[PDB]
Amino acid sequence: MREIVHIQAGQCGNQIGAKFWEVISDEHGIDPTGSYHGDSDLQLERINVYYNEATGNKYVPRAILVDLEPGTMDSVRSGPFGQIFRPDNFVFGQSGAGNNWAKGHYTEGAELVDSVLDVVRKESESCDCLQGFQLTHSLGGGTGSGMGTLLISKIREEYPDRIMNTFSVMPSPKVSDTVVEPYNATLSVHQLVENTDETYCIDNEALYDICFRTLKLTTPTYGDLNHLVSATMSGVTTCLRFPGQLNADLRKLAVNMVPFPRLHFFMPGFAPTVPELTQQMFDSKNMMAACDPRHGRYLTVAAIFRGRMSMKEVDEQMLNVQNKNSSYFVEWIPNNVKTAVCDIPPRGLKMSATFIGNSTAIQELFKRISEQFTAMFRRKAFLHWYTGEGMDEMEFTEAESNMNDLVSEYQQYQDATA
Amino acid sequence: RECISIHVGQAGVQIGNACWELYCLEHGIQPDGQMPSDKTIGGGDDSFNTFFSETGAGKHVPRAVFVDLEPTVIDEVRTGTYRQLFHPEQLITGKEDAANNYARGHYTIGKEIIDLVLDRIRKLADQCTGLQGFLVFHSFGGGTGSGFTSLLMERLSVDYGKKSKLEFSIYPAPQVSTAVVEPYNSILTTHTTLEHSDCAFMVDNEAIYDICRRNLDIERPTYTNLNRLISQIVSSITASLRFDGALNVDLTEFQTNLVPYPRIHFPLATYAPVISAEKAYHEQLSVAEITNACFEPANQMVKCDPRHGKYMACCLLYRGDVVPKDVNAAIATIKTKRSIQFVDWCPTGFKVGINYQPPTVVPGGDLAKVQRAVCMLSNTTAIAEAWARLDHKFDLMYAKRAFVHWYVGEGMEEGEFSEAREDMAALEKDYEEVGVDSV
Ligand SMILES: COc1cc(OC)c(Cl)c(-n2c(-c3ccccc3)cc(=O)c(C)c2-c2ccc(F)cc2)c1
Ligand SMILES: Nc1nc2c(ncn2[C@@H]2O[C@H](COP(=O)(O)OP(=O)(O)OP(=O)(O)O)[C@@H](O)[C@H]2O)c(=O)[nH]1
Ligand SMILES: Nc1nc2c(ncn2[C@@H]2O[C@H](COP(=O)(O)OP(=O)(O)O)[C@@H](O)[C@H]2O)c(=O)[nH]1
Ligand SMILES: [Ca+2]
Ligand SMILES: [Ca+2]
Ligand SMILES: [Ca+2]
Ligand SMILES: [Ca+2]
Ligand SMILES: [Mg+2]
Ligand SMILES: [Mg+2]
C-alpha cells in the first residue's frame, strides 16, 4: 500500500541484501518458495511494503539485484532464499568494475544502468502508492560505490518526490583491502550528501570487533558480519514493516531525524532485563560505525524495542539515559529522542533494541577519509586509472571540498548553544 | 572474462611449458585435453574457461600462442607429453633466430612473421565473449624475446587499443647469460615497450638461482628448476582468474591497486614458502610466517633491498588453508613494523585476496606440497636498483660503441640507443621522485 523498492549493488551490497531478505522473510513467515507459513496475522498487515503479491498467494520481494560481474549474482541464486527473487530482476554485467569508481559511474555501469531502471520502473508502476527506495552497497568498491550513486542520481530524476535511503558500508580506520578506497569513498560521499535523505553508516572493523570480542566468534567471516547487519537492518525497518504510528513511513522518519538536509548520516546500533538493553544500545561498543558518540552530540535519536516488555519500564529507562547524559544531547532540539515498540521479537531473541542516532561525531569518519584522500591526491597517486576513464581532476577537487564542507557543518552544530 | 597468453622466444616458450603443465594439474586436465570433472561439454562459463577453450569432443585447449623465430624449442612442445593439448596453429615458428640481436627480432626477422602471429591471435580473440587482456611471457635479453616482443606489443596496442597487456619478463643474470649484448637488448625493449605495458613482472634469474640453491638445496640449478618456480608465481597470480571464489582479484582489480603512475608499473614478486621436502617434513608454516617471509629481501625475485626503499602498494595473494582472521592479523602486524616503510601518499597500501585451492607441485619436482602459500606483488622504489645495474652495463659498452655495429647493420640508428637510454634515465629519476616525502 505504501511500497518500498529495494536495490542492492556490488558484491558487498548483494551479500548484505541477501541476508536482509533471509531475516525478514523469516520474520514475516515467508519460506524460500515464496509461500506464507506463519502463526500471527500482524506478519501480513504490512507485508505489501516490501513484498509484491503474485498469483497463487506467493509473495515475491520487491528487490532488484545489480552488479557489474556475474559471480556474486550466481551466489545469490544458489543461497538459501535465492529461489524467492524475481528472476527478471537480476541485472548483471560481465566486465566488473575493478575497484574503479569511474568505471561503475561513467563507462561500465553506464551501459547497464538503463537495464536497471527498466526493472525499477516496472516495479514502481505496480505500487498503489510508491513510498521510496532503499539501497545496500559499499563505498570502497567500484560497482556499489560508483554505479550505486549513478542509480541514485538517475532515480531522483524519475522520482524526485520520493525518499531515498541507503545502507552504506564505509571504509574503516585501520582495516582495508583496496588501495584506492579513499578515492572511491570520497567520490560517493559527495553524491550521497546531495541525493539521499537517509544514510546508515556501517564499517566492518566495528562489526568485526563485536564478532570477535562480544559474540566470541574466534574466526569471524563476512558471513558473521553480515548476520549483524541484517539483524540491524531488520531492526531499523521494524516500524516500517509492522503496525505502528511512530516513524511508520520513510518520509516521517526522515522528518524526525534530519534537522538539516546534508546532515543525514546515522550511526546504527543493536543490543543484545529492560534496563540492561537500554544501557547497551547507547554504548560505543554496540555501534556499527567507528565513531565515538562521546566525541560529539546527538542531533536526533530513534530507538526501537521489540518483544513483550513493560512499556512503563522502557519509557522510564529511556528518560534516565537522556537525563543522565544531558551533555550529549543538543539543547536546541527539545524531545529529540523518540521511542517505538513492536510486539514481534526477532528470531533467537525475545527482547531486542535497535538504535538510530544522528550524531555530529560522524564527522570523524569524514575527516579520516578526507585526510587519506588528500594524501593521495596531492601527489595524484593512482589518478591515471580515473582520468583514463574520462574524468577530470576538478571532479576530485569538488568532491573533496564538499566533504570538507560537510565536516565543517557537523562541527558548527556540535558547539552550538541555546 | 578471458585472457590470452603469448609465449615469445626460448624463455617465454619454456616458461609457458611449465605454467600450462601446472595449470592442467591444478584443474585435472589430462595431457590429451580431457577434463573428466567438466560436465559442460563444448563450452561453459566456468572459472577455468578464462584460460581454456573447449571443443565438442571434450578437449580443453589453452588460450595461448607460442612464438619463436627458430623451431628447436617449440618442436619439443609439438612432440612432448603435452603435444595434443595445443592446436597446431597455436605453435608458430620461423627458421632463423634473431641471434641475440634486438634489431633482427624487431625489424629484419620479426617483420617476416609478425602478421601471421597477429592473425592467429585474432582467431583466438574471435573465440571470446569478452576478452580482458594479454599475458606476454618473454626475456629482456634474447634477440627474439626483446626485439619481437616489442614489435608484438606495439602491434597489439593498435589492433586492441587500451586493452590490458601484462608482461612476465626475465631480467638478465651473468650466471646463465648466453649473450654479451643483453644490456643493450633490455634497455631497448624496456624503452620501446614502456608505454604499451600496463604492468610488467620482472624476474631476475640470479635471484631465482640463489633461491633454488639455498631453499631447495639444488647444487647447480637448471632452467627446468628455475622455470617451475616461476610457474608458482604465475599460478598464484592467475589463480584468482582460473578458480571460482568470492575473495578473488582480476586483471583490472590488482592493476588498479598496484600501479600508481603509468610508468611506475614494475612490481617485484615474492613467494613463500619455498621449501624442500626434507625440511617440510614435520614442519608446517603459519599464515603469519609466510606473510613475514614476503618482506625478507632474501626471498625476493629481483636482487634489491626493499628496506632501502619505500613501498607504494602491496598485493598479497594467499592460496590454500587460509582464513580471513589469520590474514587480517598478519597484515595488522606488518602495519606496525617500522622497517617496512610506505610512501606518505599511500595510507591504504594493501590489496588482499584469498583462493582456497591448495598449491600443486608437478611430480618429480623439488618444491614440497604445502597446505597454504602466499605470493606478494609489491611496487617498491627498490626496484630501481635493478635499472641502475643494467643502465651502468649499457653505459660501459655504449661509451665505446661496442657491438653497436651489429644493430646498425640491421637498420637501426645510434639515435635509438641514446633515446632509449634517456628514457631509462627519466625512469630512474621518476622512481626517486615518487619516493620523496610530500610537502
Ligand atoms: C575490509 O578490508 C579487509 C582486510 C582484510 O585483511 C587485512 C580482511 Cl581478512 C578482510 N576480511 C575478509 C577478506 C577480504 C578481502 C580479501 C580476503 C579476505 C573476509 C572476511 O570474512 C572478513 C571478516 C574480513 C575482515 C573485515 C573486517 C575486519 F576488521 C577484519 C577482517 C577485509
Ligand atoms: N628463466 C629462464 N630464462 C631463460 C630461459 N631460456 C633463456 N633464458 C634467458 O633468456 C636470455 C636469452 O634469451 P633467449 O630466450 O634464450 O633467446 P630468444 O628469446 O629465443 O631469442 P634469440 O636469441 O634471438 O633466439 C638470457 O638472459 C637467459 O638467461 C629459460 O628457459 N628460463
Ligand atoms: N560486510 C561486507 N562487506 C564487504 C563484503 N565484500 C566486500 N565488502 C566491502 O566492500 C569493499 C570491497 O568492495 P566490493 O564489495 O567488492 O565493491 P564492488 O566492486 O562494488 O563489488 C571492502 O572494503 C569491504 O569492506 C561482504 O561480503 N560483506
Ligand atoms: Ca562495453
Ligand atoms: Ca531503454
Ligand atoms: Ca565446461
Ligand atoms: Ca568438456
Ligand atoms: Mg632462441
Ligand atoms: Mg574481489
Side-chain angles (χ1 to χ4, degrees), chain A residues 1-54 56-418, chain B residues 2-194 196-281 283-337 339-439:
Chain A
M1 304 302 170
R2 294 300 305 281
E3 306 93 325
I4 297 171
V5 168
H6 170 92
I7 305 170
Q8 44 196 64
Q11 185 182 314
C12 168
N14 278 271
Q15 288 297 348
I16 278 168
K19 279 208 61 62
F20 169 75
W21 288 107
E22 295 178 21
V23 169
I24 70 166
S25 292
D26 188 76
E27 290 189 1
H28 289 284
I30 310 294
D31 71 338
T33 76
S35 312
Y36 170 73
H37 281 274
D39 61 358
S40 158
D41 274 3
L42 286 79
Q43 296 179 309
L44 304 87
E45 204 180 350
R46 304 185 82 183
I47 191 76
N48 206 7
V49 180
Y50 276 99
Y51 294 85
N52 277 319
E53 196 165 355
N57 280 315
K58 282 217 160 157
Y59 296 87
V60 190
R62 197 174 296 98
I64 304 164
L65 299 85
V66 177
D67 197 358
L68 281 150
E69 73 186 0
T72 183
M73 216 67 70
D74 277 324
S75 70
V76 166
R77 268 174 289 195
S78 71
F81 280 74
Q83 301 164 358
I84 198 172
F85 295 108
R86 185 174 221 272
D88 280 324
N89 294 15
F90 293 77
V91 180
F92 53 81
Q94 303 286 328
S95 79
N99 302 157
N100 189 312
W101 189 89
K103 279 187 176 284
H105 198 80
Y106 281 126
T107 57
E108 293 289 4
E111 196 189 9
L112 184 64
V113 71
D114 291 310
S115 299
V116 174
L117 296 167
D118 292 359
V119 181
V120 169
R121 211 173 301 104
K122 193 181 290 178
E123 285 289 0
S124 79
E125 301 194 309
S126 183
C127 294
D128 190 67
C129 175
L130 177 74
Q131 185 184 168
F133 311 85
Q134 72 174 27
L135 174 73
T136 58
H137 71 113
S138 57
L139 304 186
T143 303
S145 188
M147 195 196 187
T149 55
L150 180 74
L151 287 167
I152 283 172
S153 185
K154 291 284 194 172
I155 285 174
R156 191 170 183 196
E157 188 179 47
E158 269 201 38
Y159 312 85
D161 65 340
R162 265 56 196 255
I163 296 295
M164 174 65 69
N165 270 25
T166 82
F167 297 86
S168 307
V169 179
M170 322 295 261
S172 287
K174 297 198 300 209
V175 182
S176 80
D177 54 334
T178 75
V179 165
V180 288
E181 83 166 11
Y183 286 157
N184 297 343
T186 294
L187 289 165
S188 312
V189 169
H190 180 29
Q191 297 291 313
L192 301 170
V193 161
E194 287 306 319
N195 299 330
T196 65
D197 302 295
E198 308 161 61
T199 294
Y200 301 90
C201 301
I202 305 158
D203 85 350
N204 295 128
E205 183 166 333
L207 295 178
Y208 186 94
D209 291 342
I210 292 166
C211 276
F212 183 100
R213 301 170 182 173
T214 297
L215 291 72
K216 275 278 286 170
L217 279 298
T218 74
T219 55
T221 58
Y222 278 157
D224 297 321
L225 284 55
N226 294 350
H227 195 72
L228 273 182
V229 178
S230 48
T232 306
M233 290 178 61
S234 166
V236 307
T237 62
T238 310
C239 35
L240 310 163
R241 301 184 283 111
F242 289 112
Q245 70 167 1
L246 196 150
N247 300 345
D249 53 299
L250 291 169
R251 190 163 283 106
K252 266 187 183 180
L253 173 62
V255 171
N256 282 333
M257 293 297 296
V258 183
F260 310 99
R262 304 173 86 257
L263 316 188
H264 57 265
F265 297 95
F266 301 146
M267 272 173 48
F270 189 95
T273 74
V274 172
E276 282 161 350
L277 264 179
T278 65
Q279 195 271 335
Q280 289 193 43
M281 83 194 311
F282 278 86
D283 198 352
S284 159
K285 307 171 224 164
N286 302 55
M287 304 311 195
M288 317 298 208
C291 292
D292 196 14
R294 288 154 205 109
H295 289 147
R297 306 181 83 195
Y298 284 110
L299 301 158
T300 59
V301 172
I304 303 181
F305 292 82
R306 303 181 64 177
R308 278 174 69 258
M309 47 177 55
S310 178
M311 188 79 204
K312 171 47 193 56
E313 203 169 352
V314 169
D315 266 0
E316 160 190 90
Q317 276 298 138
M318 283 302 309
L319 277 173
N320 279 113
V321 161
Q322 290 189 71
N323 292 317
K324 180 176 174 59
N325 306 288
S326 300
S327 166
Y328 298 128
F329 295 83
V330 296
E331 325 300 357
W332 39 271
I333 305 187
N335 316 115
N336 63 348
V337 186
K338 300 297 170 185
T339 304
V341 182
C342 172
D343 288 335
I344 310 310
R347 268 58 180 169
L349 292 165
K350 214 168 198 73
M351 286 164 27
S352 84
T354 310
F355 173 95
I356 308 170
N358 191 348
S359 175
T360 63
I362 195 77
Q363 74 174 298
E364 294 183 338
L365 180 142
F366 295 128
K367 277 191 279 202
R368 289 191 292 267
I369 299 181
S370 189
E371 267 176 298
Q372 296 175 323
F373 170 98
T374 308
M376 308 186 64
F377 189 63
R378 285 205 327 238
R379 305 294 287 280
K380 298 185 179 171
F382 298 88
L383 197 61
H384 72 279
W385 289 122
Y386 298 84
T387 58
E389 303 290 315
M391 292 186 63
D392 190 69
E393 298 193 354
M394 263 288 159
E395 193 163 338
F396 283 74
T397 306
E398 298 172 5
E400 182 194 44
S401 290
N402 202 37
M403 201 163 68
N404 287 330
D405 294 349
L406 184 68
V407 170
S408 300
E409 297 176 27
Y410 270 118
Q411 188 73 42
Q412 179 192 145
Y413 300 112
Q414 178 172 303
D415 302 321
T417 73
Chain B
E2 301 171 355
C3 307
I4 283 167
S5 307
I6 305 169
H7 309 274
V8 180
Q10 180 181 295
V13 171
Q14 269 178 359
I15 280 156
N17 201 11
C19 291
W20 285 106
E21 173 182 45
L22 185 52
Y23 291 172
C24 293
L25 297 175
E26 284 180 359
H27 294 298
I29 304 177
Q30 299 171 11
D32 52 329
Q34 296 292 321
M35 190 168 84
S37 59
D38 186 10
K39 287 312 312 300
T40 61
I41 315 174
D45 59 5
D46 279 295
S47 284
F48 66 81
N49 280 127
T50 64
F51 276 60
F52 288 92
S53 80
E54 287 187 57
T55 66
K59 185 192 254 194
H60 292 67
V61 193
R63 306 186 189 272
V65 161
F66 285 56
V67 195
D68 192 358
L69 296 190
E70 62 87 20
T72 313
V73 188
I74 286 182
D75 278 351
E76 285 165 41
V77 178
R78 291 174 168 140
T79 62
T81 53
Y82 288 94
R83 67 197 167 276
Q84 299 176 77
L85 203 70
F86 307 92
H87 187 273
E89 280 184 337
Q90 288 165 257
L91 314 183
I92 304 167
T93 47
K95 281 189 179 158
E96 186 185 351
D97 65 27
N100 303 126
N101 193 329
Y102 168 98
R104 289 174 66 81
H106 190 90
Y107 298 105
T108 302
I109 311 294
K111 73 184 155 39
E112 296 299 308
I113 201 166
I114 182 63
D115 286 315
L116 173 70
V117 170
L118 291 165
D119 295 9
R120 304 284 167 80
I121 288 169
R122 178 65 78 182
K123 294 187 197 137
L124 292 177
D126 292 342
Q127 293 190 340
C128 299
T129 70
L131 179 71
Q132 292 183 20
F134 304 94
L135 286 182
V136 184
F137 302 72
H138 72 100
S139 70
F140 279 172
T144 303
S146 61
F148 184 81
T149 299
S150 294
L151 176 69
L152 176 68
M153 295 289 283
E154 284 175 322
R155 289 292 296 266
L156 291 180
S157 289
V158 173
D159 288 22
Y160 303 91
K162 276 188 84 182
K163 186 175 285 283
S164 292
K165 288 183 285 297
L166 265 57
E167 299 169 66
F168 285 96
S169 311
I170 302 296
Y171 191 81
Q175 288 74 13
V176 292
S177 86
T178 56
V180 173
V181 287
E182 296 195 353
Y184 287 162
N185 293 343
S186 305
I187 301 317
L188 293 165
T189 191
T190 299
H191 161 61
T192 301
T193 302
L194 197 158
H196 292 282
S197 183
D198 300 272
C199 190
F201 306 104
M202 316 212 287
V203 162
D204 190 339
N205 268 333
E206 176 167 330
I208 306 287
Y209 190 92
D210 290 349
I211 289 160
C212 290
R213 189 191 297 113
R214 188 179 82 252
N215 302 60
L216 304 179
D217 301 314
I218 306 190
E219 278 183 344
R220 179 47 164 87
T222 55
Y223 280 145
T224 306
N225 297 121
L226 308 186
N227 287 326
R228 307 204 202 278
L229 184 54
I230 296 174
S231 315
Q232 292 290 344
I233 294 88
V234 176
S235 169
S236 295
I237 295 170
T238 60
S240 301
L241 291 83
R242 292 180 292 108
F243 284 113
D244 197 357
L247 268 45
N248 292 351
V249 300
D250 51 350
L251 292 192
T252 304
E253 270 196 44
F254 90 107
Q255 272 164 327
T256 290
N257 299 273
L258 281 168
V259 181
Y261 302 103
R263 286 166 62 84
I264 310 311
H265 65 238
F266 294 96
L268 73 165
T270 315
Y271 189 85
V274 180
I275 53 179
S276 59
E278 279 78 3
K279 307 190 175 101
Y281 184 76
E283 191 76 37
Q284 74 189 14
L285 289 159
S286 73
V287 164
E289 285 174 317
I290 67 179
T291 305
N292 288 323
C294 287
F295 293 84
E296 286 300 75
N299 279 72
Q300 303 301 318
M301 296 292 163
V302 187
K303 282 282 192 202
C304 70
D305 193 12
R307 295 189 288 239
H308 293 157
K310 291 180 193 144
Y311 291 90
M312 297 166 286
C314 300
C315 188
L316 288 157
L317 307 170
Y318 299 84
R319 73 186 308 176
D321 187 25
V322 185
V323 288
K325 174 260 160 183
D326 287 348
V327 174
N328 171 232
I331 291 168
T333 313
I334 294 294
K335 296 194 102 173
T336 75
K337 294 293 171 79
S339 54
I340 308 178
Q341 273 198 261
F342 277 72
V343 294
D344 68 20
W345 43 268
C346 176
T348 65
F350 284 92
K351 182 74 191 180
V352 178
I354 299 178
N355 286 266
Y356 290 134
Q357 282 69 21
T360 306
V361 304
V362 293
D366 300 327
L367 277 169
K369 194 157 151 192
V370 297
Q371 315 201 13
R372 63 201 66 82
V374 64
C375 178
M376 185 173 84
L377 315 167
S378 56
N379 202 343
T380 179
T381 61
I383 203 76
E385 295 181 19
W387 300 129
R389 289 192 315 260
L390 202 65
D391 285 348
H392 184 66
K393 299 197 171 177
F394 182 105
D395 290 340
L396 284 175
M397 298 188 307
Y398 192 71
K400 320 282 182 284
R401 297 301 195 280
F403 302 98
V404 173
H405 66 102
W406 294 109
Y407 299 76
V408 177
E410 302 288 5
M412 285 179 63
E413 306 173 330
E414 275 186 16
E416 305 192 62
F417 274 77
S418 54
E419 183 182 305
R421 182 63 178 83
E422 274 150 22
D423 200 5
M424 300 300 301
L427 189 71
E428 276 197 63
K429 182 213 209 178
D430 292 352
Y431 264 94
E432 76 173 283
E433 291 177 18
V434 301
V436 172
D437 290 326
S438 303
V439 305

